[PDB]
Amino acid sequence: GEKIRKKYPDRVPVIVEKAPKARIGDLDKKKYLVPSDLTVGQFYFLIRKRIHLRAEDALFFFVNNVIPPTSATMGQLYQEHHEEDFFLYIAYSDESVYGL
Fold first, then answer.
1. Residues in Cβ contact with 45 at an 8 Å cutoff, skipping those fewer than 6 apart
2. According to UniProt, where does the site described as Cleavage lie?
3. Which residues pair with 89 in a beta bridge?
4. Looking at the domain covering 1-100, what would its CATH class be?
């Protein structure tokens, strides 16, 4: 990570975690290296299989307490959900109840 920065200072070291008591597939790693130009549609792909989900499972990414559509890019999120002073933080869950 620290070394991946000096060499790839233009990339985006995103972090991964689950909501409180989440219930999605297992996880092999919690840190993806994606370029800032990638769109939310591309990232949703590299995690999909990482969440052991497919067909029509349920899932929703929450970043910095937000849930924007796939009309954005991780690179732009860098300045938004950087969370820690080095990498960014993104978690996900399998719930979607209907607010009242």
1. none
2. 99-100
3. 15
4. alpha beta
The domain ranges of the chain are 1-100
Q: What are phi and psi of 6, to 5 degrees?
A: -45, -40
Q: In the sheet where 60-62 sits, what is the strand order?
A: 31-35, 11-18, 88-93, 60-62
Token digits of residue 54: 């497919």
Find the angle CA(36)-CA(41)-CA(43) to the nearest 5 degrees.
Answer: 55
How was this structure determined? It was done by NMR
* Helix, strand counts (H, E) of the chain: 3, 4
10 Å Cβ neighbour count for 66? 10
**3-state secondary structure (DSSP) of residue 38:** coil
